[PDB]
Amino acid sequence: HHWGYGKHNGPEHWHKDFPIAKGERQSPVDIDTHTAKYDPSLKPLSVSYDQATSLRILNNGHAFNVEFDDSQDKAVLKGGPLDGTYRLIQFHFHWGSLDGQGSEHTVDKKKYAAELHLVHWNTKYGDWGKAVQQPDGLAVLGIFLKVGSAKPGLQKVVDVLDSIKTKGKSADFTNFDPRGLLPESLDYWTYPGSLTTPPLLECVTWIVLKEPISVSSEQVLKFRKLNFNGEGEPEELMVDNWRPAQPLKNRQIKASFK
Numbered sequence: 001h002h003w004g005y006g007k008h009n010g011p012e013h014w015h016k017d018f019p020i021a022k023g024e025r026q027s028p029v030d031i032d033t034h035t036a037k038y039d040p041s042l043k044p045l046s047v048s049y050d051q052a053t054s055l056r057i058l059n060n061g062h063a064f065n066v067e068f069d070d071s072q073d074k075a076v077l078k079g080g081p082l083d084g085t086y087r088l089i090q091f092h093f094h095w096g097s098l099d100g101q102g103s104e105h106t107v108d109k110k111k112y113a114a115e116l117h118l119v120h121w122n123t124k125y126g127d128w129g130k131a132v133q134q135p136d137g138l139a140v141l142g143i144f145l146k147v148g149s150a151k152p153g154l155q156k157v158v159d160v161l162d163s164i165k166t167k168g169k170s171a172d173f174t175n176f177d178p179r180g181l182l183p184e185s186l187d188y189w190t191y192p193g194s195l196t197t198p199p200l201l202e203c204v205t206w207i208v209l210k211e212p213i214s215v216s217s218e219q220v221l222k223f224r225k226l227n228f229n230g231e232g233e234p235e236e237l238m239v240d241n242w243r244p245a246q247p248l249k250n251r252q253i254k255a256s257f258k
């Protein structure tokens with residue numbers, strides 16, 4: 001892998017190493033709120049994070065992942081458009097160099113300052129590597145961030161970032177409660193899509209919450225002090241690590257709410 005979000009290895013180049021980048025169910029997409037159809041057959045989402053066990057936070061050179069113990073059913077996502085049980089494996093964000101961009105999904109072409117991805121895999125496939133080979137292998141819960149009032153539940157994440165500034169650095173990150181990152185409402189849009197970084201596999205049921213969370217300018221400024229580069233290498237600020245909207249093609253975006 002040599003892909004990134006720089007001036008010569010960005011999303012417009014990915015198709016050369018990952019031809020599925022030009023596929024029929026790529027993510028993210030623009031959510032046209034007037035075209036998305038209310039589906040009364042969709043169920044309430046069930047976000048069961050009471051027993052979540054966070055373990056570690058890693059700068060992987062494209063974002064930072066907060067990793068969970070997914071060795072058994074602790075934190076799981078069920079219901080909504082989903083059949084079966086999906087285990088939380090990690091969350092990460094995508095963000096911008098300034099507040100007017102950062103999100104991957106857009107809403108009537110509006111870009112949010114950032115987007116949180118809570119990533120889950122379908123336990124019926126036994127492990128992540130098997131799950132990503134299946135069209136219903138993953139469920140990613142996407143939550144928009146706008147800049148305003150501080151999000152108290154995000155501050156523990158913010159405060160550890162200085163310790164994982166560069167690619168390949170990690171730190172212990174136990175006892176973090178991801179419920180503190182959820183908005184009030186679980187109203188959502190859903191559509192079939194893909195991973196938004198290589199390998200871009202078309203194995204995701206996307207669930208994107210309508211209600212954004214508010215974070216402070218100071219919180220997102222700390223995201224923007226991270227580095228894409230490794231220790232001692234020329235500093236490249238980790239900013240604009242988002243893939244733009246991809247063609248919707250023959251896909252329907254459904255709303256859980258009227």
Ligand SMILES: NS(=O)(=O)c1nc2ccccc2s1
Pocket residue numbers: 117119140194195196197198199200
């Ligand atoms: N950005 S995302 O679709 O949530 C995502 N992409 C990837 C790629 C490789 C491994 C895990 C994930 S999770």
Ligand SMILES: [Zn+2]
Pocket residue numbers: 092093094117196
């Ligand atoms: Zn993501």
